[PDB]
Design a binder for these strands. Sequence first.
RNA 1: GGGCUUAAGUUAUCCGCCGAAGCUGUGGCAACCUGUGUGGUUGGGUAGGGGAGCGUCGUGUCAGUGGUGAAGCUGCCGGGU
Lengths: 48, 102, 210, 119, 58
Amino acid sequence: AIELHDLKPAPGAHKAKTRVGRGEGSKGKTAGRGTKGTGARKNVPEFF
Amino acid sequence: MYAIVRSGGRQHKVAVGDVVEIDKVADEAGSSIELTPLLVVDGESVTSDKDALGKVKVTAEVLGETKGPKIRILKYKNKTGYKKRQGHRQKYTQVKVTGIEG
Amino acid sequence: ETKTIDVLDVKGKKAGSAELPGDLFDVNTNIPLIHQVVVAQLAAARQGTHATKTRGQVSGGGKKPWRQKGTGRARQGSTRAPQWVGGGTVHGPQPRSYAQRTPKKMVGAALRGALSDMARDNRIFVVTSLVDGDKPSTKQAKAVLSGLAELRKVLVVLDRSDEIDWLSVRNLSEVHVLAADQLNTYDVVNARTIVFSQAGLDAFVGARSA
Amino acid sequence: ARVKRSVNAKKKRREVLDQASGYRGQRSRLYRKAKEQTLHSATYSFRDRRAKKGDFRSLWIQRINAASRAQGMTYNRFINGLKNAGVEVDRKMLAELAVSDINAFNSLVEVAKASQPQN
Amino acid sequence: MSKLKITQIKSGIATKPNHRETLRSLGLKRIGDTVIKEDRPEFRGMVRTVRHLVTMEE
RNA sequence: GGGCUUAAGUUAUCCGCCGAAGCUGUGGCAACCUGUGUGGUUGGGUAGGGGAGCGUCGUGUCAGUGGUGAAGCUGCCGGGU
Ligand SMILES: [Mg+2]
Ligand SMILES: [Mg+2]
Ligand SMILES: [Mg+2]
Ligand SMILES: [Mg+2]
Ligand SMILES: [Mg+2]
Ligand SMILES: [Mg+2]
Ligand SMILES: [Mg+2]
Ligand SMILES: [Mg+2]
Ligand SMILES: [Mg+2]
Ligand SMILES: [Mg+2]
Ligand SMILES: [Mg+2]
Ligand SMILES: [Mg+2]
Ligand SMILES: [Mg+2]
Ligand SMILES: [Mg+2]
Ligand SMILES: [Mg+2]
Ligand SMILES: [Mg+2]
Ligand SMILES: [Mg+2]
Ligand SMILES: [Mg+2]
Ligand SMILES: [Mg+2]
Ligand SMILES: [Mg+2]
Ligand SMILES: [Mg+2]
Ligand SMILES: [Mg+2]
Ligand SMILES: [Mg+2]
């Protein structure tokens, strides 16, 4: 007699997706990359 | 007849029948509290010394809990992206002075 | 717990008896497990035919709108750039499948727990059949209302020629009809009671039993 | 699931335009310009709620100074006299006494005079 | 043993990390904070190390 | 800056006071530690790391609700960190 509205996930099983670049109260603006440089825009290869 | 009394680290000039905005205290509404007096003036007669102020009792009763104005804090600094929002209400307690008995 | 219990076949009034095997119809109801299985079920049910045109797929926009310098306008590379009205969508939806590869043991166990919860709550009835001879919806509406309430599941299993019961209960709109080989956790949880046909319960037990 | 921004977006704009409902020029009409002034308004209000203590203490001290100098006693000697006499009536009640009950304030002045070190 | 009484009169800001760690070891945490220590040479040493930040008594 | 040597200048010394979001008093909030009756410590903050949430749209389920007026828009009176 659970009924579909009593089904909930275990606590901690569904971590909230972090949404970046959506204000300065979170990972905002630079989006966790800092300022300028290669890493500001793409990446650096692991073999480099 | 009036008394300079203290309550919660803040002083008031009270008289019998006055309503005073006291810092929140644990005593429940309708009960009675004693406000510590720091001065008594009965008209050209000023009781000021500790020994005599010990004998005088300012008695008052609790009316209810009232809230202060809603305060909106927005801490901000330019060119950093920093902001911090906050609010405050600062509940107090109504008091009615019922008597200043020497 | 693995207790096998006994329910009584009805056919409206009374008939023989049927056994709930216990190893299924009496197991734990892992709510998180059931939730995951049901969510995966609905995700598989999703169709996901949604699409947008990127800046490369929007018509036109091949040439630079104007010179890079000298005009006093911002540097633009195409009229279909995402910041333009009528330009491409950057990270809009694309067609995809939402099906999740839930393990067999998880899916089955969830089904067992969902069945077991209302087996312990006494919401499974077994009937020899509904309707006799030719097939109406009035008859079975009665058989089920005599059973209890109107948020129902029916099992008739007989996938090829149980047209009588299937077509009788097909049009109730508060009855969900299934073959025993398609019980599935979503429908079991959604059901407030299950009524098995004798053959339906027998075939489900035969398909899965220890 | 395309989402249109307007219904959610207008809420902060209405809040800020309400908060800026006495400002001059663009500061009370335009959300962006009102937003800049509300930052300054919040900073000023926070700073002034803490400077208010000092402002009112200064006002009380000036009034006490005037009232005691009317009795031939400077503020510093008056406060030292009260401290030595052990009367812990504060700058606020003292200023209210000076404005309202000048006779009680003068009696306190006499108390301070008597409690002076006389040295 | 005379139970030294040490109180902090100046802040630790801009002082040397030596001095700040000495204050922490003495247990002083704010200006005006007071601690009681035994008349032990280590505590006399801490007091003389931060002598410009604290006052001592008996 | 006004003005100041009739110091309101320099200097030695003594007695007071002013003075910060420091300290203390009082009231509220929060993080952490601790034996878990207490209490202790802490809470400026950019890049950035961690944690917990608000609001919008779609949607399963249950409970509903709506021309005796939904959505949206717009006043007033309130509420929350
Ligand atoms: Mg930032
Ligand atoms: Mg920005
Ligand atoms: Mg990073
Ligand atoms: Mg950058
Ligand atoms: Mg940049
Ligand atoms: Mg750089
Ligand atoms: Mg970098
Ligand atoms: Mg790296
Ligand atoms: Mg590569
Ligand atoms: Mg900067
Ligand atoms: Mg192209
Ligand atoms: Mg231009
Ligand atoms: Mg190009
Ligand atoms: Mg288009
Ligand atoms: Mg003056
Ligand atoms: Mg202060
Ligand atoms: Mg402080
Ligand atoms: Mg304090
Ligand atoms: Mg912080
Ligand atoms: Mg701090
Ligand atoms: Mg940061
Ligand atoms: Mg209706
Ligand atoms: Mg809508």
